Design a protein around this ligand. Structure first.
Ligand SMILES: Cc1ncc(C[n+]2csc(CCOP(=O)(O)OP(=O)(O)O)c2C)c(N)n1
Ligand SMILES: Cc1ncc(C[n+]2csc(CCOP(=O)(O)OP(=O)(O)O)c2C)c(N)n1
Ligand SMILES: Cc1ncc(C[n+]2csc(CCOP(=O)(O)OP(=O)(O)O)c2C)c(N)n1
Ligand SMILES: [Mg+2]
Ligand SMILES: [Mg+2]
Ligand SMILES: [Mg+2]
Lengths: 562, 562, 562
């Protein structure tokens, strides 16, 4: 028959293995909407394009697969910029399909047309391109997919002029190709794999730090066989945590942010193995905090820029992180000459424990519900059947203190962009990935960050998504209000207080469950209540503002343990 | 004494004459926040950076001045992109002040940093530029203002590294320089102005069409001098309508879209003078449905691409629209012999009025409130004491049909980008520019577009803004659903129905007045009620889905009077 | 019949009045070649696309019209970058027509395809754009011409995919539109015009400075009437010098660079009138050496960025420079009472003349011909019938000192880009424009610079172009060798000597008249010889290296006088 370019897009995505798209409708991309309707593909349609974009991210992260986002021309695309920017830095594999002006209505001042979407998207994407001919649609779509999913994973834009989409050709003119890209990643040269193992055996205090790319390939069975052979502790940046949930408990060092007072302990790691973790913000930069200059560092990253960009390393290998762990278990299933790491692993869990006691010792929840305490109520329900998504300022800095101790099904936190509010978006789409697994999603967000996408309680309800939103309400933009007294001066705070409005009143008005809580018990009663029930909820949690997280004081450059 | 890069900016904006900024606080730009506090200059902080940017647009357009927008690094900037794009196409003079990563922490994977902000805004701005030394700030800020304000007016982006903002210097070492740019625009060469007036005299059915740029300089008394002398009617595209409000009633033609039904009456304009109107969406592209190919066209635009871009004109002048009007009055003051236009002007008002009676005659509001009947209820409250702001899909297309009859102090509608939801931001900042002038602002929005910025009721209450928001709620993304049922098929509707949620409840949750009305009486009661009170209000108006606005059928290329 | 997209281009250029192209043939752009050959418009085909690009600049600047460059896809476009860049900063109206890959051969790794040609040209052009439809060619080309030719004049890039160019439509289906854009530019307000004149009347030591845009619009008759009425002296940067050749000699201040030693004379100008000169390289920046801080500045520029960008000004008008000179003569036709400026005019020509003898006084041509003495030889032939083109390092810094006194038909020197070797290109194109005027072109280049485009002697020969090329050969990259010893150290000069080659031998091996000269008499004799002959000539002049252009010392910030 004769199908439209819109249909050609959809066949190609179905051929890849795509089963959900997140989007918001426009006349310009309606041919895709029509084709999805025809091929029984869900198109979760949100209230803001950005929220749909982040929804694709969360699906991609929580799902360990490709996320797809669909936005209309002009305003559709520009509303989509923040999720693209976010997925760019988080290294999140998301295909962004956008409509634009008709080729033939080029340069005529028509509606939603005239802005250079690929130009805009270029410095934010692994690849961005505008389709010039309908026959190109199947192969350009697959190309776009391949680029996003290969290492390092990242966001890709495909600009589908209205003109090309509506247009129609003969089904036989064109070939819908398969996704013919191996699921297995590239492995290091046998020469280096041996040198890195030789180094790890000589190590007295060795550690491994997992990055985002450990989670995208998700090679758990091979990682377990490897830790089970060498017996070395394992840390991760935020994205990496999901991986540490198949590991014995003494071999779990937790969040990379623990390796801080390992110096002040005369116990600083002897060697560091970085698999996908970059010398960015999550690893304490080139400063030496979490990773020590003295230490001999082995860094694996598909992207050779990252190889000792900030510190000098000892060995740097270009390869896929997931494909590397496979090559690691394989070469460690004959060794058997691996030292006992008891005394080392012992202190690792000890130092993490001291921090947990040191914060619980500082926590007074006498007058207003301390935030470190509230996070514990949440900790109580976190296991492999629960994806946790974090947003807000101080509120996610408090969760990190409680997150090393539990074993989550997914954990999705801020990337280098650190854009407040992308929480709803990411969380929503996370739940759609979690529906298959039976996992349930919980968003822990700030009173500020919820305001960005508050309308999404509508989408939650319309699409029947049982996401629980916990709003840690301190009646302010938390992180910034602290900066104002702590970096500027006590009496002068502006543009940061948010002392107005029932967020729970909003959610109830949008059709979701309202809960209001201020005490520890009030909160635990409500969280267990919302979890028991199988529909969307909002919990407005009154927390103190004054308390200063240890992580806030690390990042400006001070010791919270001195 | 010693100053910081932030202070330098604030002093430079004050020497320009700026009295409000719209922003959203982040630590990267806190320096400006602090300097503003010192100088009693208000920063209206919203819930989303987008809403802030659009608020600067609304400030600018309704204020006939520069609108200033301030956003933080990274997510702060990318969230502000929809406002920049809109400002670009609307030709709206807005200065966009963005923070970025520190210069000394360049290329290190730090926080909110690594996205090429200037590159991203390049295709959307008259000028984009990242500041490289703290002493450059005062002259780089002024150069940005001049860039923004010169014709054609447009957005300008100025990236201030955090490094450079926090950074510190001597008061007398650098110079806060003055705003030296003449307010009066450039005039056509007299030989061309004479060609034009000669042409205008010989015309049998002459019209004038105003664009954005007429409203920007706002030379009202020079238009009245010119119309009341040649006696020619005057039309305007959306941005230009504000300018027709101090004009004699007979020589007002209304919105440029009334020139449709002018052919079928053998009364198509003989000559068309276009002052800032571009050929494109507002003026019926190159089709000659509005501007007939037969007519002698005279076009005046600051930007030369624009001159006869889609049609052939007889005269194309590069000049300021504002200054061209001044010359049009100048050259008309001695000229005694202008023909009588009484019969033609009678014909213009006659054709426009037949249109109105034709719509009312086809409008039943018995089963559910007709969107037209609803639009009339609003129009009876519109005079020069009111700025009406429009958003949504079908809802604004209906409102246009009543807007030609009333003389508004401001009318801010969709530009070419047609981004749904920009209504809140613009409407908010419009109310800020309106407070000083004493005028009151109404936003007339659809049920879809309001969901975009619905947390902004928070800003409406925190900041004490008596903005009334009418939601024309047809429980669907109206305009796209009409495309789906009319051009694809009645049973093929997906992703456009919005069958959920109390919007008036949402406003009531943030502390605004809630109204839910459905009949003509109820709504008029509700509107008059909210207007009496100096308070932020939300009117949720239940309106019909089925009716097709005459503009929907015109823009698709059909006759709606057939 | 049916014509080609190539034909559609040529028909449109023809309607603009384009009578010559500069280019270099590729198969992608052959349809334009066929259409030019069909319609007898000459395409001057050079040996390098950069020479073709620059030749178009010279044609534009020397003919005071639009210039058109035509380069093929890929290498054709990239070779064209330096001319586009130069035209951008010189403000030169140049249409760049480029081929690119076939739309339907998109992303297929083909011949000459794949490089984002509009992206690369975006920051270098007023407008860069890829043509998307064969129907579009006529209106897009004219839109391009309008954008290049509007104030401020600058280069435009039009990308014409080979696919769309080969395409064939029906003649009658598309309309080849006229150039309807008034040749007179916009004039200043009459409030401001009068303020400037009253300020000019109150002035005690007023001066006028013409910049690039004065030569573009070329409003000579209006300038003669204006200086001859107020009697104020008049300077110019390099581009502006051509206009000073229709002026009584005492009223000629010459090159703007004379106003240097005017301060230490207590003769620093009271008031400065800037017509299109920008605060920058030619005008001693924001430093106030040439354009004093004490003095009141009145600045007129099409681009408002420029208005007091580096100094504070007293008045700043957005207007076309050509139009402003008109308005000025106009307003001076009634103004009978302009004071006598005899005392000031005399002082001016006196100081410029003293500086001149000050250099001849310190010049010795005994052991090798002095570069200034050599410059004087050339000055003896410069009149209204000669276009002089300068290139090279020291060699042109020497001419400037001799150039103020003589009144040339054209004078084309380096723009802000200051790119060596662009001489042949610009000069060759200059000679083509000069054929209509009867003027002859003479290029003064250095030994390093001729080296860039040396093969162009071949184009001079094949194409019968009697351009005379004087090489001031000091067997080195002069300017950089001087920086090395004068700012770095005596004994450390590397990579700057060019002690090799017969340049005259090269020109003769290509077909042109070869001359070798080292003394004053040899040089004057041969220069006079090649001029009598109506052929292309090369003159290789051995000049001294050790000398030091006063300008070379006026730019590090030091003083070549007191
Ligand atoms: C998109 C974006 N990202 C980051 C910032 C800067 N920022 C970092 S933390 C913060 C306050 C967040 O408040 P909230 O979400 O309530 O969390 P809290 O720290 O108050 O608990 C802001 C404004 C910003 N202004 N915009
Ligand atoms: C930012 C943006 N997103 C999506 C669209 C596509 N679109 C055009 S009209 C329309 C429906 C608008 O709905 P609503 O605000 O309720 O107005 P109404 O239903 O009354 O027409 C949509 C989704 C758009 N033009 N801009
Ligand atoms: C395109 C380009 N422009 C400028 C320079 C830097 N530069 C400025 S002057 C100069 C020497 C010019 O030598 P020549 O052409 O012989 O003139 P001379 O001063 O030696 O007489 C150089 C290399 C450069 N390397 N490349
Ligand atoms: Mg908070
Ligand atoms: Mg609606
Ligand atoms: Mg030389």
């Amino acid at each position: 028959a004769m199908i439209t370019g819109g249909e050609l897009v959809v066949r190609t995505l179905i051929k890849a293995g795509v089963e959900h798209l997140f989007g918001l409708h426009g006349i310009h991309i309606d041919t895709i909407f029509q084709a999805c309707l025809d091929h029984d593909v869900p198109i979760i349609d949100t209230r803001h394009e950005a929220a749909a974009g982040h929804a694709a991210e969360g699906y991609a992260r929580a799902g360990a697969k490709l996320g797809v986002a669909l936005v209309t021309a002009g305003g559709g695309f520009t509303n989509a910029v923040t999720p693209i920017a976010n997925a760019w830095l988080d290294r999140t594999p998301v295909l962004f399909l956008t409509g634009s002006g008709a080729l033939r209505d080029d340069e005529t001042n028509t509606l939603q047309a005239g802005i250079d979407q690929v130009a805009m998207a270029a410095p934010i994407t692994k690849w961005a391109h505008r389709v010039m001919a309908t026959e190109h649609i199947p192969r350009l779509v697959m190309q776009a997919i391949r680029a996003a999913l290969s290492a390092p994973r990242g966001p890709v834009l495909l600009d589908l002029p209205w003109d090309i989409l509506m247009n129609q050709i003969d089904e036989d003119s064109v070939i819908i190709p398969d996704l013919v890209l191996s699921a297995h990643g590239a492995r290091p040269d046998p020469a280096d794999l041996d040198q890195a193992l030789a180094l790890l055996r000589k190590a007295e205090r060795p550690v491994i730090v997992l990055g985002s790319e450990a989670s995208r390939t998700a090679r758990k069975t091979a990682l377990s066989a490897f830790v089970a052979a060498t017996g070395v502790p394992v840390f991760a940046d935020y994205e990496g945590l999901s991986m540490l949930s198949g590991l014995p408990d003494a071999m779990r060092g937790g969040l990379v942010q623990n390796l801080y007072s390992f110096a002040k302990a005369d116990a600083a790691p002897d060697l560091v193995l970085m698999l996908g973790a970059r010398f960015g913000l999550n690893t304490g930069h080139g400063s030496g905090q979490l990773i020590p200059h003295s230490a001999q560092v082995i860094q694996v990253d598909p992207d050779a820029c990252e190889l000792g960009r900030l510190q000098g390393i000892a060995l740097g290998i270009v390869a896929d992180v997931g494909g590397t762990i496979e090559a690691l278990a394989q070469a460690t299933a004959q060794d058997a000459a691996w030292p006992d790491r008891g005394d080392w692993c012992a202190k690792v869990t000890d130092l993490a424990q001291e921090r947990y006691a040191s914060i619980a010792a500082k926590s007074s929840s006498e007058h207003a519900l301390h935030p470190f305490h509230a996070s514990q109520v949440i900790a109580k329900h976190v296991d492999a059947g629960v994806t946790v998504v974090a947003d807000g300022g101080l509120t996610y800095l408090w969760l990190s203190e409680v997150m090393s101790r539990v074993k989550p099904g997914g954990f999705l936190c801020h990337g280098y962009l650190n854009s407040m509010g992308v929480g709803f978006g990411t969380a929503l789409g996370a739940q759609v990935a979690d529906l298959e697994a039976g996992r349930r999603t919980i968003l822990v967000t700030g009173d500020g960050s919820v305001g960005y996408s508050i309308g999404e309680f509508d989408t939650l309800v319309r699409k029947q998504l049982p996401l629980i939103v916990i709003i840690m309400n301190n009646q302010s933009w938390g992180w910034t209000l602290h900066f104002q007294q702590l970096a500027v001066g006590p009496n002068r705070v502006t543009g940061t207080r948010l002392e107005n409005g029932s967020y729970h009143g909003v959610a109830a008005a949008f059709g979701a469950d309202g809960y209001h809580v201020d005490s520890v018990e009030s909160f635990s009663a409500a969280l267990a209540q919302a979890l028991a029930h199988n529909r969307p909820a909002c919990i407005n949690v009154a927390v103190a503002l004054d308390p200063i997280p240890p992580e806030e004081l690390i990042l400006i450059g001070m010791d919270p343990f001195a």
